């Protein structure tokens, strides 16, 4: 017997105390070690309602990631609120590790185990856990990287599909690798990401098939982002401490709905901070081969409005509200207070 409630969670992880990597350093002083013997209990004859779009755990993870980045990254110049802060900017070691979110005494986490659960409504296979699974705090736009996969079918998630201003999270059931590289040998900020077009276009085709099921079999068209800042019009992520911006036009090629797809990328030293606080400048990139191989596990999409009059629906790669990144992993959990 319990009741939905919000409370302050703590974090746990397997951070190494001897590592200089900044996530390990943060988690070493802001998280406790993981519990060696996890205690998950299936709750029999128990149905429970979930709502991933009103889940205070999302707000709490966002606060953690903001804190982590604020004490880890070291721009040479920070421009925020009309002021300018200049400081030392050594190169850092950067590579996310899994963070587990845990309830204090008197509370527990309920976990939805229905494999086609869309994030809202009743769940018939519910268990209780003390902590979530390990979630990597990967900050990206357009593509969700290094996350968990849907266990059966591709899942379309939205707080309201009819409202085109609401972001769509596409949860994939097969990961697709994206392999990004700034080579050793020219223009030191020039990079590229390689994706196996065979695997990708197959998944994309399956994604379009799912979208048809929710939009009454209209024609599904992909278009590049309309406009905005580069962090939004590009797939932006952080690889080894460097800020990558990749052009995803060839990833959403309507015609292919087989060879290697090569996306042009650039590392940028001057960025708009995803925390919303302003602009920051970092030092030039490190020497040598900079390489990140990530698994694409989801896609953020925004649907064009005003198209009811037509027979097609147009989708543009989306993102920017990084909270949706955490929502994509926390959708199956909720906190309750034991009574
Ligand atoms: N120029 C406009 C500005 N947009 C941003 O700040 C913004 C959005 C997303 C990112 C971002 C994403 C990913 C990465 C990384 F590389 F790490 F993956 C870096 N940045 N930045 C604002 N308009 C209004 C606002 C409210 O006050 S904020
Ligand atoms: C999710 O499931 C609920 C309950 O079955 C339904 O009301 C809602 O429309 C669904 N959302 C999507 C995006 O399928
Ligand atoms: C992923 O889901 C699609 C339908 O959404 C299904 O046809 C496909 O077989 C699934 N793939 C895997 C590997 O389960
Ligand atoms: C969903 O969005 C449509 C279009 O904006 C709106 O008319 C409707 O009221 C929304 N539904 C809910 C439950 O907010
Ligand atoms: C990633 O791409 C580079 C080429 O830049 C290649 O050397 C490397 O083997 C690739 N890695 C994987 C896992 O495909
Ligand atoms: C992406 O590439 C296409 C074609 O190369 C180009 O027309 C478009 O402007 C690029 N997008 C951005 C945001 O630079
Ligand atoms: C994704 O995970 C791999 C393996 O740990 C890592 O090398 C890569 O840097 C990660 N990608 C991002 C964007 O953090």
Numbering used by the authors: 44 to 124, 198 to 301, 324 to 355, 357 to 396, 411 to 492
What did the study's authors say about this model?
The trifluoro-methane group of NBD-14204 in region I contacted Thr257, Glu370, Ile371, and Trp427 with hydrophobic interaction. In addition, the pyrrole ring showed hydrophobic contact in region II with Trp427. Unlike NBD-14204, the nitrogen atom in the pyrrole ring of NBD-14208 made a hydrogen bond to the carbonyl oxygen of Asn425. Both structures showed that their amine groups in region III made hydrogen bonds to Asp368.
Our group has made significant progress toward meeting this critical need by developing a new class of HIV-1 entry inhibitors (we termed NBDs) targeting the Phe43 cavity of HIV-1 gp120, a different binding site from that targeted by Fostemsavir. NBDs inhibit gp120 binding to the cellular receptor CD4 by direct binding to the Phe43 cavity of HIV-1 envelope glycoprotein gp120. To determine the crystal structures of HIV-1 gp120 core in complex with NBD-14204 or NBD-14208, we used a clade A/E 93TH057 HIV-1 gp120 core with His375 to Ser substitution, which enabled us to produce well-diffracting crystals consistently. The structures revealed that the compounds mimicked the binding of Phe43 of CD4 to gp120 and occupied the cavity in the CD4 binding site of gp120, as shown in previously reported structures of NBD compounds.
